[PDB]
Structure formats: C-alpha cells, structure tokens
Amino acid sequence: EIESLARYAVDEHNKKQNSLLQFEKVVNTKQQVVSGTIYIITLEAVDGGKKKVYEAKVWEKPWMNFKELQEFKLIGDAPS
Amino acid sequence: EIESLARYAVDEHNKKQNSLLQFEKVVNTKQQVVSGTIYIITLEAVDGGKKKVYEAKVWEKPWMNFKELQEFKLIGDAPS
C-alpha cells in the first residue's frame, strides 16, 4: 500500500540528486483528496519590449478561493 | 474568468524571478480535472549511515497507474 509510494518517493528523490537514501519505514501518512481544475493557459506577454508566448499551468479550487501556479514556461517569440 | 488566472500566473512568475513580463492576452486554455490522492508520508531513511526523517508528498491516481512525487524534504535526524 503506502510503503510502495514511500519507496517510489525515495527512489525518485535519489534519482534526482544521485543520493542513496536507504528507505527504512513509513512512520505515518496523511492523505488529502485532490480536486479542482488545472488550467493550461497559453498567453502572450511582453518581455523587454518583445511580445512572447508562454504556457502557464494554474490549479484552482474556486469554492475555496484557492489558486496555485504549478508551472510557467516560455513557448517562443511572437512574429516579428 | 480565465484572464484573472493568467494575470495571476504572470504576477507569480514575475514575483519569483523579479521579471516584468507584461501580460497581453490569453490565446487558449486547456483544462484538466484534478483528482486522486496526495499522500503526505513521514518516513525514516538512512543517509550516509545516519537515520533521518523525511516528508514526501506523492500524488496518486491508481485507476490510471499514475504516481508523481510532488515534494520531498528533510525533517531531521532520528535520535542518536
């Protein structure tokens, strides 16, 4: 059950930074139901005088007045 | 509607790196329903011979065989 997710977490953490944390045991797990919407927004914005295109991923739970930026990247220049 | 989330995204991005991207417009939005469970796992793992305590946040959508590590941090040393 949860031990598999904990080993995965350690494995992924180790793979990220080339560490060798050696999983021992789960102490306790809390769990949170995940809900709401992710908006994958393609948008235009001007950067130093040049218009460019970006992609933003924003998580919203509007009934809670909650929003959180998840990811934001440059797509490329708008046409010259 | 979506323009507010796009301005928030640009605002949060700007606040992160002290840039002044100037939002122009939304081109298109895709949206994805967010579901599944986040497990906040407190676990013990050994690092260079010393047992320590970590917190991992793992998102699971088991009906899709999906899992994703969201966050992983050191809590502290186990007792000496």
φ/ψ region of B64 (left if φ > 0, alpha if ψ in -120 to 50, else beta) reads alpha
Q: How far apart are CA B38 and CA A29, in angstroms?
A: 10
* Residue numbers after which chain B breaks, C to N beyond 2.5 angstroms: none
Handedness of CA B30, B31, B36, B41 (dihedral sign): positive
Nearest to B4 by CA among B29, B34, B39: B29
CB contact under 8 A, A10 and B43: yes
CB neighbourhood size of B56 (10 A): 24
Residue the block writes with tokens 């009906």: B63
Q: Where do the structural domains in chain B lie, given as residue ranges?
A: 1-80
Q: Which residue of A has its CA nearest to B36?
A: A34
Contacts of B9 in chain A (CB under 8 A): 41, 43, 56, 58, 69, 72
Give B60 to chain A, closest Cα distance, Å: 9
Q: What residues pair up with B46 in beta bridges, in sequence order?
A: A22, B51
Method: X-ray
Question: CA distances (Å), B16 to each of A20, A59, B5, B11, B19, in order?
Answer: 31, 17, 16, 9, 8
DSSP code of residue A36: S
Q: Which string of b and e fits A58-67 if b means at least 16 CB within 10 Å?
A: bbbeeeeeeb
Reduce the DSSP state of residue B18 to 3 states and report it. Answer: coil
Residue the block writes with tokens 């994958």: A40
Residue the block writes with tokens 């927004």: A41
